[PDB]
Amino acid sequence: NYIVPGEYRVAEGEIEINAGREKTTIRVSNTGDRPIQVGSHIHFVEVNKELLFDRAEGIGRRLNIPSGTAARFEPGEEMEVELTELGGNREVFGISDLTNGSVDNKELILQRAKELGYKGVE
């Protein structure tokens, strides 16, 4: 019965994020000499050119991490990350200008990624 003013009494259980969406694990390498941190809601194919991964596996996806958090890659660091699917209309505009429409246009996204030197387009 000690009172902490405004304290929470949270319920039992756990919160599952991005429930029901496909998950994908991929290896990602920071080939640059400066650190790269990637937020939860950036279209994963549009991250920093010097991140090396299978760019096709970033299309229509983002990191499967709590909303508002980020994954960090130190210079030269390679690690696995888990991606989830974008929702809503599954459209991306702006950011790196690789998509500007449906994420279903994989051919077009990868052509633009390759032309601009985003590492890991097969």
Binding site: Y2, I3, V4, P5, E7
Partner: protein
């Protein structure tokens, strides 16, 4: 004196600290604004004394203890922040969890 706006406001903190120290001296457990005032004034006077930001980050955790304050006050105060003129100009001091 050439008081600027901050100098005028910060006189209030010193005053509230003096009030709170009188209340503590006559045996009262201090409340939330009292505790904040005492620790804040301590930081500003420490800067004036020429202590470092690092010294005040340490000392500010030992100004008041749990038995100086009312139930719940330690858990109400996550941080106390003050800016004061150090020998090397204005700096920000944050005292985290000042009262355990």
């Amino acid at each position: 004196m050439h008081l600027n706006p901050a100098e005028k406001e910060k006189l209030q903190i010193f005053l509230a600290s003096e009030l709170a120290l009188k209340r503590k001296a006559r045996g009262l457990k201090l409340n939330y604004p009292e505790a904040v005032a005492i620790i804040t004034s301590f930081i500003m006077e420490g800067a004036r004394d020429g202590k470092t930001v690092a010294m005040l980050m340490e000392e500010g955790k030992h100004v008041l203890t749990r038995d100086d304050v009312m139930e719940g006050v330690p858990e109400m105060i996550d941080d106390i922040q003050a800016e004061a003129t150090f020998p090397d100009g204005t700096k920000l001091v944050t005292v985290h969890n000042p009262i355990s």
